Every structure is written in C-alpha cells, then in structure tokens.
Amino acid sequence: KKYSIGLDIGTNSVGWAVITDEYKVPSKKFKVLGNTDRHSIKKNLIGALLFDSGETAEATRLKRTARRRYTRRKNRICYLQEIFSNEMAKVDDSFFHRLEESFLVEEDKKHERHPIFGNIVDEVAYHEKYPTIYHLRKKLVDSTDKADLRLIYLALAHMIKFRGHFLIEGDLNPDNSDVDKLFIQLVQTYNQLFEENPINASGVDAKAILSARLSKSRRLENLIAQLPGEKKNGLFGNLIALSLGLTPNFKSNFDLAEDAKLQLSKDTYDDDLDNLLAQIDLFLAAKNLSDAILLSDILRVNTEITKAPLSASMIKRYDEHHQDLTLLKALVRQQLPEKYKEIFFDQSKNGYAGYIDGGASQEEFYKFIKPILEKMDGTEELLVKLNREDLLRKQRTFDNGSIPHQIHLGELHAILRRQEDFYPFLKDNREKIEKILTFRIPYYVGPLARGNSRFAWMTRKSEETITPWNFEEVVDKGASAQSFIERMTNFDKNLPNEKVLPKHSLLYEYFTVYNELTKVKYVTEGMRKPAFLSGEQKKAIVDLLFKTNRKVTVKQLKEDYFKKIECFDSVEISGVEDRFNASLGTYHDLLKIIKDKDFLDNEENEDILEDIVLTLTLFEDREMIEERLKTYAHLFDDKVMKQLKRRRYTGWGRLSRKLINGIRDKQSGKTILDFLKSDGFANRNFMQLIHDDSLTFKEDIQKAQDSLHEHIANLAGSPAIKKGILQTVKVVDELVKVMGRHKPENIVIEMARENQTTQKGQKNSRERMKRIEEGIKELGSQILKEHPVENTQLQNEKLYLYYLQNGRDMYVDQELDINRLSDYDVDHIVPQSFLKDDSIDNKVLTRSDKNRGKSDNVPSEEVVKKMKNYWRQLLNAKLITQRKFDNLTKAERGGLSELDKAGFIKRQLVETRQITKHVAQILDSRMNTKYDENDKLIREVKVITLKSKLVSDFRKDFQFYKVREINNYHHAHDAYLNAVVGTALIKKYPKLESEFVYGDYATAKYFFYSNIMNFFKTEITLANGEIRKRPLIETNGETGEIVWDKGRDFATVRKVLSMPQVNIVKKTEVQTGGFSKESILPKRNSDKLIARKKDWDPKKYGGFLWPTVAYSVLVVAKVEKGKSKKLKSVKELLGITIMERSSFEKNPIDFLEAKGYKEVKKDLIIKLPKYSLFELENGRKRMLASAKQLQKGNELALPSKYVNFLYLASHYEKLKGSPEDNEQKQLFVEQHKHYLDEIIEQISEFSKRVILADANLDKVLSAYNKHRDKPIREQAENIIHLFTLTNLGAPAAFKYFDTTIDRKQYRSTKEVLDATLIHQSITGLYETRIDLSQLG
RNA sequence: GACGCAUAAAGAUGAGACGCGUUUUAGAGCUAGAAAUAGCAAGUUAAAAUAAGGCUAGUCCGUUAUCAACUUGAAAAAGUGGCACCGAGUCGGUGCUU
DNA sequence: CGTTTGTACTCCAGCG
DNA sequence: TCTCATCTTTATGCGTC
DNA sequence: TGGAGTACAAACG
Ligand SMILES: [Mg+2]
Ligand SMILES: [Mg+2]
Ligand SMILES: [Mg+2]
Ligand SMILES: [Mg+2]
Ligand SMILES: [Mg+2]
C-alpha cells in the first residue's frame, strides 16, 4: 500500500513517478469528464510536466528605466519651453506648436508645414546657412550680434536634449583650458616658485605626446628629450602631476614643499594640496593642462581659437565629409563608371547610398568600400583616413558617448553669455537653464513618486512638486539615501526584526576573530592532551598580534606569542592551518587614521565607533558623510575628520548587534561576545552557544521568531524560480490526492549538488591574485611591479580584467589606464542579444568606441587577424582560457551560428539549484507537519536529496542509457530512477539515512559516495582484477529485510523504462509581455500594421507588425460575405492580442461585433491559451501555438533497445569503461547494424501516422538511402537528428549529413475546430474531453 | 541536512544616466522632355514618438510572478474523479464494487 | 468563370 | 555600454549544531 | 519560432 514519489526538477520541466514498495509503477483507471462518450482511461502513474521558463525581471527593468528616462527628457524640454514661452510669444507664437506637430503629414498639420520659420524661403535660407545644428551652435557661441530667439532656443534645446554623460566628476572647464600652449605658463610659474634657476628655454610642447596615444613612456621620453630640467620633479615629477597620476604607495620624490604622496587630479587632490597650500600657484596650472590634454584627446580640435570645440570638431567632420565625397565621386566616375550606381544610388547594398539613406553602418560601409578604394588609383589619403576610421563620418555617430556633459555645458554657457545682453530674460534665468541641463536625480533618491510606486523609497519634506530648482529643498536626501540601503539589506535570521551589522563593524570583526580563536587547540611536549586557549590567553593573543598585524599566520602565532610570552619551546596548533580567516582590518584602518590607540581600545566609546562605521557604510556621498560625522568632530582633530570622510566601506554581515552583544543569559549575564571572549573551560563558539540548552540564548532566539502562492511571494530572489517551485509543489499535491490523499513514504529529490576531491576544490577556488601572478610571471611583464595591487581590490571587474590583459586593450594594440577605467567598457565577446553568458570567458575590457563599433557581433576578421598573436600570448600565459580564445576568434569559424546557439546556458544550473533547494524545504514543511513536544518534529515523510552523480552512475553502469533527443520521456524516467535509487539506498543502509534525508545529520567524503553504490552490482571491480562476488539478494543486514534482488528488480526497472504510455503534459500559458515586436515599419497600404499612437494612421505613418496573441477564442457566429453581401454562419478561432486583451475581457460581445462577427453565441466562447491540446483521428495530437499555427503534440515511444543502441553507436569513443567492456560494446554495435533500418521504419511509421510531413519524410528516406554506406558512428549521430521531425513541440529544422530538411509550419488551425479538446490537470491524469464537433 | 568565517565561480534584484537605431515631416532636386524614362546633381542635420495608454495626476504607472476543466465563492482559495489482477504501441482486457 | 482559401518557399526579429 | 547598491546558489578549507 | 508576404493553383459562387 505504501508508496514513494520521485522528482526530477529542471528549469523548464518537472518529471514525476510513483513507485510502490516493489519498484513497480502503479496504473489506474481515471474518470474522464466532458460530453464525449469515453468514460475512463487507464494511465500509468509516471510522466513529466513541461512549461516555458520563467523570465527574469531584467528585461522589464531595462524597459522601465528607459521609460523613466524618456519621461524625464520630455520634461527637460518642457522646462526650457516654459522658460521661453513669454518671449517667444513676441516673435512667433505658434513656434512650439509647429515643433510639437512636426511629425504629422501636411494635411494633419494645423500650422504651416515648415517648423522653424514658417515659410519656404526662410526655411531654405536657414538650412543653407547652417547645414547642421553644430554650425548654428558654433555660430551662436562665437558671434556677438543679436541672434534670433528661435535659433537660440534650437541650440539650447539640442544641448538640453542630448546632454552627454556624467562620468567625469568635477567641473571640467573648457573655457579655462583646451589651450595646450599653457605649457608656457607652466614653465614660467615653475621658474617663479622654484628658485634654483630652473630650466625655462622649453622646446616642443606636449603636442608631440598628444599626436600619439598618451602614455608614461611617450611623456617621459619627450620631456627628457626636450626639457632636461634641474630636478626630476621639475622636468617629470611636476608635469606628470599635470597629466599623469602616481601608482606607488611610498612618498613622493624629494620634497619641494612637502614630501607627501601625489596623484592625478582626483576628487581628493584639492585636499591633497595640503602639501603646498600650508607650505607655500604652481599647481594651479595643473588643472588647466590636465583638462587641456583630456579635452584634446576627446576632441581633435587644437589649432582653432574657437570657444566651441565640440561644435568645431563636428563642423570639421562635415567639411571633410563634403570634400572626400566630392573626391570619391570624381574618382569613381573617371575610373569605375559601371560601379557608380551601385555605390551612390543602390541603397540595398553597403555603398554610400546604403550608408546614408539605407541601413548600413559605418563599419559595413568601410568594409564594402575598401576593396574599391584599394583597386582604384589616387585614393591614398582615402585609404589612410579609412584605416584611421575617419572617412565620411556622420556628425552623430555611435561613439559620441564619450562627450562629457561639461562640454555641452561650456557651449551653452557661452551662448547665454553672448545673447544675455539682447534678451534680458536669458540673463535672469541663466542659472535655471544651466540647472535644467545639468540636473540629475541621485541614484539613491529613486523615482520621485508620491506613494503610488512599488519601486520608490524617496521621502519628501513637503508636497510641493519637484523641479530641478527646488529638488534640494523638497527631497529629504539624507533619509532617502539611508532608505536606499535599508530597503535592500537582509534582516538577522535568528532575530527577524533586527537589521544586520555592517560587515566592517568593530563588533562584527571582534565576533569573527574571537569565534575563530576560541576553538583553536595547542599542544606541546609537556602537555598530555591539547587544550583550548584560556580567556587570558585569548586576550593576550588579540592585544599582541591581532591588533598589530592585519593578518595572523600560524607561524606568527607560534613564534611571537608561544615562544616569547609564556615561553613554550615548540608547539602544535590545531584549528587553523596556515592563516587565520579572521582579521581586525577595520581596527587597523581606524588606527591608521585615529592615531589614538587608546580611543579604539576604550570600551565606553564603542557605540561612537560603531556609529562611525555604520555611517561610512550607509552613505557614500562626501557631503552626506560630513553632515553625519559633524557631531563627532569634538572627539577628533580636523585632519582626522578630513581623513575619516575618505573611509569608504561596503557590505553587510549576517548577524545583528542585538544577537551578538545585546541579549544576555539570565543566569550569567554574559552576552554571546562575552562567552566567546572568555567561557572558562568549555570555550563554546557561536553555533554551540545559540544551541546550548542550559543557556537562555536558545529560547530567546526561539521565541523571537496564507496560501503557498503568498509564501512564494514572500521569499526573495529572482521571479524565475517561483514558477518551477510552484509547479512542482502542485504536482506533488496532485499525486498525493490521486493516491487516496495518503502521504507518500519517501519523496526523492534529485539535487544538483556535487562532491569534489579536496585537491580539485582547492584548485578551482584559488585566489584571483594568484591567477594573475602566475600568468604575469609566465609572460614576463612588469605590470605588478609598476602597479602594486591586493586581492581585495581585484573584486572590481574592470580592474581584474585590466590585470588579466597585462594592461592592454584586447581589440587594439594600445595601453589601458588604471586611473581612467570608467572610460572603458566591459565588452561581451559573444553579444548579449545572442547568448546569455556573463562569465569571464565572455567579458573583455576595451575602449568604448571599439566596443560600440563592434555592435552585437563577435570581433571582426580584421580585428582577429591583428590581435590573434596577442591573444595566443595571453592563452600561453593562461590568463585567458581556451573558451575565451574560442569566443574571441569565432569569426574565423563562421561567426555566429545556430549550432553555437544550441546549448544549456550557465544560468539554468543556478536556477535549478535554487528551485530544488526551496522545493525540498517547502515539501518537508508541508508533509512533515505533525509536531511533538518530546521530539520537535515527527518525520512522517522522508524527503531524500540524492545527488545527480548517483543516478548518472546507475544509468551508466546498468546500461539504462539516456538520450535526450528522442522524446521527453527521459524526465519521467529520471524521476523513476531517482525514486528507485533513493528508496533502495534508504532501505539498504538505514544508519546512513541521516545523510540523505533532509534535516538529519572532502576526498574521504567523495570516496564514500562512490563506494556506497556498490551493492547494486553483482561483481565489484578492483584495479588488480580482484572481484567481490556480491550475492544476488541484498538484505538490510541488522533486520534481514530484503531490499534489492538483482534477479528481478533490474527486470522491473527495464520493463518500466519501456512503458509506452507516459503522461507528458505541456502547461497551457496565456501569453503576457510586449504588445508586439519593437521594429517600427514604414507606411504601407496594409491593415496588418498597428498604429503606434492613437492619432497616427499606420497607412500614413507606419507602425508595428508582429502582434503577440494572448489567447485564442472559439467563436461560433455569422459573418457577412459573398459577391452580394450575406451573413453566413461560421466557426473559427480569433486571436485576442495583448493590446486588446483588456478590451475583449471588458465586453466580449461588443468586441466581437466590432470585429464583424454577428450573433455570437456568448455561451460558446472558449478561452484557448497557448498549447491547448486537441486530439484528431489516429491519435494525432496538435497543440495550439496561436490562432493560425498548430504545434505537433505526439510523442514517439522508441524501444529501449534502440535507445541504448543509439547511445552506444554514438559516443563511440567516449564510453569511459574498461577496455574489454568498450571492445565488447563495439562488437555489439557491429552485430546490430539492422537497428538502423528498424529505427527508420519506426520513425517513418510515426511520421505517416501523426506528423504528416510527407515531403520531409521523403527527403529523409532518400538521404538515409543515399548515405547508408557511411560509417555506423556517423549514421547514428545523424539519425539522432531525425528525431527533430518527431519531437513534441514546434515544427523545426534539422540535417542529415548534408541534406538540410526545412520546417513545415502547420499554418492551418481549422482541422482542430472539429476535434476533441483535452483539459489536462497538472499531472495529466485528470482529463476533460470536449468534442468540438458537437458545438453548433 | 543546516550555520559563521575565508577563498572562488556562476547568477540575481532595484536605482540613476549616456550613445545610437527606427518611423513621419522639414531641408524647393535640375534638364531635355508628350514622356513612359534617362541623364546630371544632391546626401552628413533637425523636430516629434519610442510599448497603444492609464488615474490616485506623480518629473508616477504600463513587457517579471500569478492561470487545466467543472461545482462553489464579490474574490483569494477550497472542494469533486471506485479496486485488484492479467497484460501492453501512447494504454487494453477481465473480475470486483456504488 | 472569379476568387480564396489553401500549400511552398523565404524571410522577418532594436542595440551598445 | 557607464555609475551605485544589496542579495542568492554551489565548490573547497577552518569551527560547530 | 510565430508572423508576413509573394506566388501559385486547386476549389467553390
Ligand atoms: Mg535531473
Ligand atoms: Mg559589445
Ligand atoms: Mg530533466
Ligand atoms: Mg508571464
Ligand atoms: Mg551547501
């Protein structure tokens, strides 16, 4: 009577099987409801459930943030317009209306069809005078006469709409820079301040270093060659401070005013000026020259005296584009007359016409045009510019994202300065306009909601609307920044009302250090047995070598302490191997700032120190930190406070203040930390304390501690795993209901965990600092000696990639910059839009322009050819992996391809692990619910957690081979074998059920799980040839109960795996998501187009074209049709797309009448989600994919002998058995060649019965017959592909050796209108069969 | 099986920004021309939208999660489906029982 | 005769 | 693609229930 | 992997 349930849970399916105590799968007759004549169905209690994977909220978050950005951009433009409105009403009162309705066609426009000026001659004259907006912007910057208010508005609105990035902190001032000839002022001011007759007769300026890539090498060599100064600081050590930072941690060179360290012009440099401001401007020109150098690097404009460098560069682009276009046209006409149309008219190619008016990109145009230019003559300059990526550039290209907002701000400020004299209102609210451009909501304030958003946390001081000019006084930024962190941090698990301590808190570090130190044992010659450290010893050890060294080694412990204090000649330490995992890093960091050791050591100020660390952890805005720490300046010096505001900490711990040091034992009065610091002779650590029965901590924690859908909503994590968890729990509940509501004896969950040898684990978890160290050593570079680094810092992704590349770019042969890594970007080699892979094998650090030129592609053939040698050097140094090299060079093997698309992404394993871990405990709490007071929980249902290694070894040892492609039965079979193996193990080794059951309790651990599975085998193999002939009958041992009979139990398993009928059910899902595909299409005379705004007719404006159907509805009604119009009754499926799902559900009859259906029978409207299952003649089943396409729903039941033979013929040389076993299986393969013909006959019969892909089957048969002389291995490997013809799901495509058989989309959902509709429960055991032929 | 610490892999959730891209309109194409066309010239920019839209009207919200049928319930949710054996091509036969 | 569903084939898909 | 933050799953080492 | 759009030709009004 008693039974068990197995589960094989995946991210896209759940397999389930029910087994009795004899390992048989029971079968029952189930009643079937509905109007059909069939009354009951016999069904085996084994099957699988398939469903579409749950989607992560990442793609929704990206859309939501984009929506917010557009909403705020339109508001910026509206603010500028509201400023201009009154003065614009003087000159042109309809100007903003004409701008706003510019999209509409001529007849839809209320005003004149020329937006700016409103008349043809003025509009043409404007577009002739200022061919681009950058001409207008430069003219307004550099022209002192009164400009037109419309032109001023257009320039300002362009800058305010497209305002550049904010990654460069501080006020880069182009108006006080960009004159690279300030080097003269540099040398003069140096001569004034440094008095020992310094060199003044300068040679060539920094222009020589600007021409090539900026580098320490280039700068140093040029300065040595041209300006041999009197001191290295005067010649090199100052000019670097004007351009280049300093990496070494030691002090600077010989002091001119103070010897303290220097660096580039950071946010902390102005506070690093204490080396001169208190000691004296020479360093004032540092900012000037630095900003000149960076702005020259960004913008290739140096000679001109313009005050608009970006606009000047864009105008130079326009001029070069014009001139080179003229030259190219002339050359092509006089040298290649037959290519002129294909280059300059044919927009379907990648010529100039396809570059401008087509869709070709700059790289595609360059690749198309380079052969033509090479074979032509007189194009040397064009080739040079093309190889420099400067030929025929547009003024708005992909790489404008390196323009900081400070450049646009400089141009806007200059314009307002020029025109503020003639338009006084521009003088009045210049500040308002600049704030509109430069305002940006802090990331810690979030959406400025007023209570109606579930993403917002901002707290506002008043109800006044927030604008850039009153944001600072309406938004409570302090509380908002605190809630930003506090809304995401975990609570304490033991005390679920308490926030956790900051990971760097002094209490947390003390708890960690003492909790580790209290369990170490020392032994010596005189000691009889090792004994714990006493309270005095732990106190002395802490104050001696934990508070004076950042990390403590066993060597330090047993040399400095045990041989100097309490002298022991020699000692053995247990409980630490090489180094203490714990440290007082926060203590040392606060000691290097707070010179007062006694302040740290005092107990009374511990609250103040804790609040300081909590502030430095919560807030990272410098003014915010200063405001919070302002109350603590009366304990410290002002220099000390200036240092404190520099101490950034991140990360939060697992335990709270109250748990660690707040709750006290009633009897002793000690806290947990006090017990750790001194607990006499017991020395109980935290785990042993909170579980001690004699201490009140256990009860204090215990007393300090709805639908399943609600609980699932409670748990954190991604929403992807929720679907799988809920579906498998529903499956288990339905199985329990099916078995007379009697709970199963055992539930066996297949866990995705794994045991590894200690060597393998230590290898795979080595420090990334070591990973860099051996590689850099092997390739012999000096990067580590030039840029000292520590393992903690390498957690930064860009820094880690920098060191993995030896400080060079991976797509160009150029150096990177440690001090400017925010410029570069982390490029995905295989693009994000193609494959989800964020592993380091997929990431590369490179300049933003190269990344964005390489849009959604693998690196091009040219890039591969240039950089393959460098990639090979890195691979030899083992900095990059073979996987990374294969990703990088994928363009040499055909680029992106569907065989590369085919695989399991690495995210699926993680989601599977999370789903199984949550499902195990959910099932345990749902099943084992009968508590008791003598023992806490009565374990009614054992939830076994097997590892997949056991079942894989069972399959591979007893030749129950698994081939995924044949059908979906392998999920059900994996569930069945999980149940069998789990119950057999539990019954055979009851003492070790405390290792499998959930809730009971590494090379040795690895060997154990290998040796445990031996009792299934008749003969155990040793390396020397010895065999232990285990008996055919396996008994429990202590009890004598029989568990595994190798005679008949394998027969039962084999019989079950050959069961034809396995309940595969595919979950019917109503589609939700985007209304349609995102591509906006040009206007056409079609009704398939969707209007992208309510007033924009698609026949005139274009629109979207691939609507997503939420569900179909079966409508039986009458439609007017005929050569003379006449209502005819009709039955057909109508697709209710996502856009109008709400419109239909509001009023189905009104919606259908609007569709043109007349006299709809409201009773016969049926909702038909995706994958609704229909059965037709001969068991041909069709799942509904939409209202126009059906999916094949039948499953092929291939015999186990053929499945095993296929797995053996394929994988021919990777069976990984013994040599004799492999040879015998080989002879098996030769002696069963007829299996190929039998399998083809099987597949052909199945196709002719239910697939009905007649032409594809003919192609398959012809290909098989033509290639039947090929080797057996290749025949097997290719015949595995033919199961794409018969797989459940969508018609897809495949290939025999060379013949590619295409797809046969069943685009006819009319055959199903007279079939039987099946409503299948979650397990598929309960059905309701509606015969649609009986509806009329 | 869980927990703390150290190392590491692979992932996740929320916020703030940038750059493109597409769509319609504006930038008078000219010449011989019945001209069906052809020649020639032009080309780089801008405005607007970027899920349709929503109501609590916010510089907010709108693509994640929830869903077999039927009987119930404003809903969430719950409730309903006979057994053994012999077999086996997607489940069948037989015998029991209301 | 004049359509109109029906099949075959091809090709479509916002991104860094 | 940039910036900021928090969190999870698994593997090995040290210590525990 | 569902939609879309052309060409084609059997199939009804
Ligand atoms: Mg599995
Ligand atoms: Mg990229
Ligand atoms: Mg599976
Ligand atoms: Mg969904
Ligand atoms: Mg674990």
Numbering used by the authors: 3 to 282, 288 to 712, 718 to 1013, 1032 to 1366
What's the paper's own text on this?
CRISPR-Cas9 is a powerful tool for genome editing, but the strict requirement for an NGG protospacer-adjacent motif (PAM) sequence immediately next to the DNA target limits the number of editable genes.
While SpRY loses all PAM specificity, SpG retains specificity for guanine at position 2 of the PAM through residue R1333. To probe whether SpG and SpRY operate through analogous mechanisms of engaging diverse PAM sequences, we determined the structures of SpG bound to NGG and NGC PAM-containing DNA substrates with global resolutions of 3.1 Å and 3.6 Å, respectively. Intriguingly, the mutations G1218K and R1335Q, which adopt different rotamers for different PAM sequences in SpRY, maintain the same rotamer conformation in the context of SpG. This observation raises the possibility that R1333 in SpG is pre-ordered and poised for rapid PAM recognition similar to Cas9.
